Design a protein around this ligand. Structure first.
Ligand SMILES: [K+]
Ligand SMILES: [K+]
Ligand SMILES: [K+]
Ligand SMILES: [K+]
Ligand SMILES: [K+]
Ligand SMILES: [K+]
Ligand SMILES: [K+]
Ligand SMILES: [K+]
Ligand SMILES: [K+]
Ligand SMILES: [K+]
Ligand SMILES: [K+]
Ligand SMILES: [K+]
Ligand SMILES: [Mg+2]
Ligand SMILES: [Mg+2]
Ligand SMILES: [Mg+2]
Ligand SMILES: [Mg+2]
Ligand SMILES: [Mg+2]
Ligand SMILES: [Mg+2]
Ligand SMILES: [Mg+2]
Ligand SMILES: [Mg+2]
Ligand SMILES: [Mg+2]
Ligand SMILES: [Mg+2]
Ligand SMILES: [Mg+2]
Ligand SMILES: [Mg+2]
Ligand SMILES: [Mg+2]
Ligand SMILES: [Mg+2]
Ligand SMILES: [Mg+2]
Ligand SMILES: [Mg+2]
Ligand SMILES: [Mg+2]
Ligand SMILES: [Mg+2]
Ligand SMILES: [Mg+2]
Ligand SMILES: [Mg+2]
Ligand SMILES: [Mg+2]
Ligand SMILES: [Mg+2]
Ligand SMILES: [Mg+2]
Ligand SMILES: [Mg+2]
Ligand SMILES: [Mg+2]
Ligand SMILES: [Mg+2]
Ligand SMILES: [Mg+2]
Ligand SMILES: [Mg+2]
Ligand SMILES: [Mg+2]
Ligand SMILES: [Mg+2]
Ligand SMILES: [Mg+2]
Ligand SMILES: [Mg+2]
Ligand SMILES: [Mg+2]
Ligand SMILES: [Mg+2]
Ligand SMILES: [Mg+2]
Ligand SMILES: [Mg+2]
Ligand SMILES: [Mg+2]
Lengths: 313, 23, 132, 129, 208
RNA sequence: GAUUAACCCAAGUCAAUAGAAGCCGGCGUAAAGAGUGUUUUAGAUCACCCCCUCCCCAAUAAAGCUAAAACUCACCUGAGUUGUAAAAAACUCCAGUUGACACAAAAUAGACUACGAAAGUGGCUUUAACAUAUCUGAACACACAAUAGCUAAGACCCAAACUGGGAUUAGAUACCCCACUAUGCUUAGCCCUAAACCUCAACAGUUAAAUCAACAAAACUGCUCGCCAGAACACUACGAGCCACAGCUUAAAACUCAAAGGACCUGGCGGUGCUUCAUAUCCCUCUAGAGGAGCCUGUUCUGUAAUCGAUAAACCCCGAUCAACCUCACCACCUCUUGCUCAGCCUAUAUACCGCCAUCUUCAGCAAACCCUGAUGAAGGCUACAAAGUAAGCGCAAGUACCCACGUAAAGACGUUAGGUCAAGGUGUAGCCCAUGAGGUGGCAAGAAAUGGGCUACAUUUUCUACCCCAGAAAACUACGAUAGCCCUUAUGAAACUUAAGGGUCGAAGGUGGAUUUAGC
């Protein structure tokens, strides 16, 4: 399905007329009608619940919709425009030629936030199909260019093939410190373990009292291991007997409830400890939601993993 | 090459020697 | 190997529509439902009766517009209204399409005791999604 | 590969074409499939080295003959000139030899294109008057 | 696993974190700045920062657990540790001032030493050779030595020879026997050593 | 075979038989260079011209000799030695050290490539000694000819057919272990055979043209002798010759067949090599099970007048998310005939099929259209410092669902097993039509036995009660242990010794289960 320039030009004329129609339908100014408004209006007028968004109704600009097509690479006389046409990879080899030429001129003269573009992004800048070894050879040639004393002209070029990657900080978020009617500072957080959901209120000052659904923690958790879980966050930061806690937990069993409270208390306790202590709690596994939940049973087998006995042959 | 032609002669000669021994 | 509602790969010469090209696991993901009614919602009744009616209307329209249907029917129910939306070809004369619309809407309205409307969308040829 | 950069530049400067990279099967004998039914093939192929990197004849020597394209080629003492239309015995290894060849062909091509414009221009001026 | 490979195990050790910066080496400084960028698994609901945490006893307890019944497994463990301590206090009060010095009353010291006295130094692996399987003496890694000491202790207490004796009384009695290099679990170790000795000539059959 | 039509020839047609129709081709692997050399009569032109590897290295015969290792004997020490995947038998005047000591065999050199006609010849010395001043040439002769074998007389370390013993095996007339003979050695005579093959004849010459079926050790010219002409019968029969007497050489025919044969391609397979790995996975390892008991359930057998299908992996709580009547397709009896249907059929055929699936798949490949390689054969198509492949599409992948980007689902092509299903429904072909169709009544669906899956147990990490984890009791013939048996009640139903639930009574096997085996990261 090749698409000519005349075909795309007609598709853009339709999109601009339809863009004004869509704005007229919704009673909005056609001049200030953006692509975000188009998507909102199309989702209302043509509601689709299909799980894959690519299968849903779309009214995008032709440039966004249609794929990139290389233009004709020769004229009426049949002479190709580019001197590397007969390689079949004129854009790739023209780039290798340009990078190789810069490496030569340097000799005559003489990380965290960025990555190399992937093969599928190079294959779009060039508008050609590339092998994996072609991609490697090009990257090996760019790396060889950074190690050299590349100037400003040789730095704008390398940055074209570098894509900024947004590292996400692992630093734990801190809850706001609130104040009650009596003026006592406290923090509040939540935790989930299996099907248990907990919400804990940790007071800045206290004597070590913990109330779980209004009950003393040792009466609510008669099993000693459930109480060790409540001790774990405070003990790890040397704050046993320094805070009062009132928490509520629902769902799950006794152990899942102790785990949900442990996570809720640890997150809320992060408001009253130093930043270095919060990173130690994170590295100790006290601030991570356990993703381990029951696996579904599959049909045709006894359990989530166990298979029916392989019958004796 | 295979030895299939030799094998035919091998058996012929074996059976002949045994026949001569028997008679 | 799974067979259900799968048009199988060939030599690249078999035209399939969008409906035909998607196996059942794509239902509700890439393809929608061909009939929409409330019988299969939680707490709703008469799903069996809506299903029988749908099977009939599909067979009925196949034989009432023989060789004219270019895709599956889309069945819509709102209140007691029944809307039949069909994509048809442009071979039969328009007089015959008006006869069959009047005939089908009337006959189906008396059969199922509900107002039935037939909406025809014509295409020059069967719309091809891909060649398997 | 020692002269890939030099040869690619010589082609661009004279307004011609260079293929110094790995030669994929069928660039010439299957060009219509690879490039398109209206692709125009070269009218002349000039080999500055007739051997590939395993010391065998470049596949395009055979394929140029298959497509009935005349070939000019520098043929060293270890090369096979049978199928080269216009072979030129000469050293293909020394940079001084290879640079000379590029100067000569570049100069021959550049002069011939300038001559074509001179003749055409004169033929037009005289035509009007 | 529901954890992507990127998730690292949590390090639960208060001392590891309070250690001053100056004491740190350039290698240990890099590991600490690295972990600040890594994903950390949630701490399992077993091990905590408590000072009364013993990884060996927690492991022995899990090897006693039947069908996920940790409460019962933990109950038996603490009853065994209490039964060991009470038996030693009784031997201590009934002893003379001289013998009292040699009587150990810590059940954790007895438990650890009892297992170390049952760990086998050599092992035997079956090897197929010439159509007959041969038992062959082979060194055992430290992990395997510790596991076998525990598995033999639990197996002995589960033996039906014991009639109506509760596990805390059986296990406590077996630990104190092994603590004194006596009992059936020590004999099981000696037998493995005697069988490995008698198969000394077959050591060469090993290829690793 | 009949029949219709057609085709060929035609007063002929054509069944049987016979004849006509054949030597300038070959001989590394398809048949074929005869085990080797040398004549005559002859043939050749490779003989005069015109020329370059004489001597020495492991030819041959004879005589003499011996360094290493054995055997034997002797002294002194030891209690074992031998045998190996592991054993037994065997020896124990045995073993180890040292010394004396061959009619046997000839490390290293030898990575040399020599000698001889071939067969053969590789320790040392000496004697004799290696034809032909054109070439080819004896299957009508002559002289040779490995190993084995024969005759006679000797030697005898070691090896060793046969034989005996040991072991293995269903058997073991073998392979493995021990012992020992003929025999291998010498002398004197025979025998005259080898995959006697470097399966490639001697002499002379060439490297250009067409290089050339394939493979092998590139393709040919001149000349000559020998040999070959489908397979098998047949290294055979007969005749003849021979020191040969179960021998050797020469060597057919009848009957039989449409092949046999040579070399390759692809695939499969290999108790197939190397390398690297498997990740609940092959071994070891980890945990809980099955295999033992009772019971539940399927199947096989047996039984019954009394269905069917699945039935190695990939059947066996499978079609059934389900049989007291019904369901039902089965059996017995009775009844109806245009029949609920512009009839009907659960009748045969899943080896005619659609449909929906199993299986490898816990895979990543399939492939149109081109292009190129192989002399334009079956076939094959890659090396990134790249050498002929380009590849739409399909699958994987990606996306989506579920709690994430993880996991689990889902997905998973082309093909494989004529895999499953005509009894889901539909349907090709064939068959039934007063019956192979339709209806009614009643009935079967059991257990000598075997087996698969499961359930509950054999108990103290237990049993009962309270509680839902700080308790009290129980704990071996009144314990643990049946969801079984028997009796009663209830529920559903028109119908219940029959199905389910509860109660009472009863208190059995079982005391943790061999070989083997299942599941889980
Ligand atoms: K006649
Ligand atoms: K012969
Ligand atoms: K040698
Ligand atoms: K020698
Ligand atoms: K040979
Ligand atoms: K093969
Ligand atoms: K069992
Ligand atoms: K079972
Ligand atoms: K089928
Ligand atoms: K059917
Ligand atoms: K049928
Ligand atoms: K009882
Ligand atoms: Mg389970
Ligand atoms: Mg072979
Ligand atoms: Mg024969
Ligand atoms: Mg499947
Ligand atoms: Mg050169
Ligand atoms: Mg032959
Ligand atoms: Mg010869
Ligand atoms: Mg002769
Ligand atoms: Mg002669
Ligand atoms: Mg002889
Ligand atoms: Mg002899
Ligand atoms: Mg001997
Ligand atoms: Mg002898
Ligand atoms: Mg001798
Ligand atoms: Mg020989
Ligand atoms: Mg011969
Ligand atoms: Mg001759
Ligand atoms: Mg013949
Ligand atoms: Mg013979
Ligand atoms: Mg004979
Ligand atoms: Mg005779
Ligand atoms: Mg497994
Ligand atoms: Mg059983
Ligand atoms: Mg059956
Ligand atoms: Mg059957
Ligand atoms: Mg069948
Ligand atoms: Mg009935
Ligand atoms: Mg019935
Ligand atoms: Mg019937
Ligand atoms: Mg089938
Ligand atoms: Mg996913
Ligand atoms: Mg799946
Ligand atoms: Mg997928
Ligand atoms: Mg079949
Ligand atoms: Mg009937
Ligand atoms: Mg009962
Ligand atoms: Mg009743």
């Amino acid at each position: 399905e090749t698409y000519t320039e005349d075909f795309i030009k007609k598709q853009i004329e339709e999109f601009n007329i339809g863009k004004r129609h869509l704005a007229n339908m919704m009673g909005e100014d056609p001049e200030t009608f953006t692509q975000e408004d188009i998507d909102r209006a199309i989702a209302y007028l043509f509601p689709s619940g299909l799980f894959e968004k690519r299968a849903r109704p779309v009214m995008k600009h032709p440039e966004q919709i249609f794929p990139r097509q290389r233009a004709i690479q020769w004229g009426e006389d049949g002479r190709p425009f580019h001197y590397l046409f007969y390689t079949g990879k004129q854009s790739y080899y023209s780039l290798m030629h340009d990078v190789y030429g810069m490496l030569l001129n340097l000799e005559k003269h003489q990380v965290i936030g960025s990555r190399w573009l992937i093969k599928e992004e190079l294959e779009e800048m060039l508008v050609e199909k590339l092998s994996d070894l072609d991609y490697m050879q090009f990257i090996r040639l760019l790396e060889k260019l950074l190690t050299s004393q590349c100037g400003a002209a040789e730095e704008e070029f390398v940055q074209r093939f570098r894509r900024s990657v947004t590292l996400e900080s692992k630093k734990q978020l801190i809850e706001p410190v609130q104040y009650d009617e009596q003026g006592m500072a406290f923090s509040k957080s939540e935790g989930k373990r299996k099907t248990a959901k907990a919400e804990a209120i940790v007071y800045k000052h206290g004597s070590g009292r913990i109330k779980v659904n209004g009950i003393d923690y040792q009466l609510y958790f008669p099993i000693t291991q459930d109480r060790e879980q409540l001790m774990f966050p405070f003990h790890f930061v040397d704050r046993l007997g320094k805070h009062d806690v009132t928490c509520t937990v629902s769902g799950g069993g006794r152990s899942a409830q102790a785990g949900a409270i442990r996570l809720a208390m640890a997150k809320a306790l992060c408001s009253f400890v130093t930043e270095d202590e919060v990173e130690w709690m994170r590295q100790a596994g006290l601030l991570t939601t356990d993703p381990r939940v029951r696996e579904r049973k599959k049909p045709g087998q006894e359990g989530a993993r166990r298979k029916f006995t392989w019958k004796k042959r | 090459k295979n030895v299939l032609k030799i094998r035919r002669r091998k058996m012929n000669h074996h059976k002949y020697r045994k026949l001569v021994k028997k008679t | 190997k799974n067979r259900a509602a799968r048009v199988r790969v060939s030599k690249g010469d078999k035209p399939v529509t969008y409906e035909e090209a998607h196996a059942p696991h794509y239902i509700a993901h890439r393809k929608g439902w061909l009939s929409l009614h409330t019988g299969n919602l939680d707490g709703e009744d008469h799903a069996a009766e809506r299903t029988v009616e749908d099977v009939f209307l599909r067979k009925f329209m196949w034989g009432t517009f023989p060789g004219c249907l270019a895709d599956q029917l889309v069945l819509k129910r709102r209140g007691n209204q029944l809307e039949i939306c069909a994509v048809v070809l442009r071979q039969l004369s328009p007089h015959k399409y008006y006869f069959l619309v009047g005939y089908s809407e009337t006959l189906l309205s008396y059969f199922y005791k509900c107002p039935v409307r037939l909406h025809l969308q014509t295409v020059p040829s069967k719309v091809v999604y891909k060649y398997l | 590969r020692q002269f890939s950069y030099l040869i690619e530049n010589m082609a661009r400067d004279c307004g011609e074409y260079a293929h110094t990279r790995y030669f994929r099967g069928g660039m010439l004998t299957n060009a219509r499939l690879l490039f398109g039914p209206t692709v125009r093939l070269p009218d002349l192929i000039i080999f500055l080295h007739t051997l590939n990197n395993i010391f065998e004849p470049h596949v395009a020597v055979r394929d140029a003959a298959k497509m009935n394209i005349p070939t000019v080629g520098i043929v060293d003492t270890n090369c096979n000139p049978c199928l080269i239309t216009y072979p030129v015995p000469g050293n293909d290894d020394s940079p001084l030899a290879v640079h000379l060849y590029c100067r000569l062909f570049q100069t021959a091509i550049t002069r011939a294109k300038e001559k074509r414009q001179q003749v055409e221009a004169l033929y037009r001026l005289q035509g009007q008057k | 696993s529901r954890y992507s490979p990127e998730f690292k195990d949590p390090l639960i050790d208060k001392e590891y974190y309070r250690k001053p910066v100056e004491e740190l080496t350039e290698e240990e400084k890099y590991v600490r700045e690295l972990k600040k960028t890594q994903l950390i698994k949630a701490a399992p609901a077993g091990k905590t920062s408590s000072v009364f945490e013993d990884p060996v006893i927690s492991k022995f307890t899990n090897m006693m657990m039947i069908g996920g019944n940790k409460v019962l497994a933990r109950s038996l463990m603490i009853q065994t540790l209490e039964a060991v301590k009470r038996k030693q206090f009784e031997k201590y009060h009934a002893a003379s001032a001289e013998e009292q010095a040699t009587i150990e009353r810590n059940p954790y010291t007895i438990f650890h030493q009892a297992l170390k006295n049952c760990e086998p130094m050599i092992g035997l692996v079956p090897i197929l050779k010439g159509g007959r399987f041969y038992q062959v003496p082979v060194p055992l890694p430290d992990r395997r030595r510790r596991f076998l000491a525990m598995k033999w202790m639990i197996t002995e207490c589960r033996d039906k020879k014991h009639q109506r004796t509760l596990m805390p009384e059986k296990l406590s009695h077996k630990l104190l026997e092994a603590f004194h290099n006596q009992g059936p679990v020590i004999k099981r170790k000696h037998d493995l050593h005697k069988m490995a000795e008698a198969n000394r000539a077959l050591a060469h059959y090993r290829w690793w």
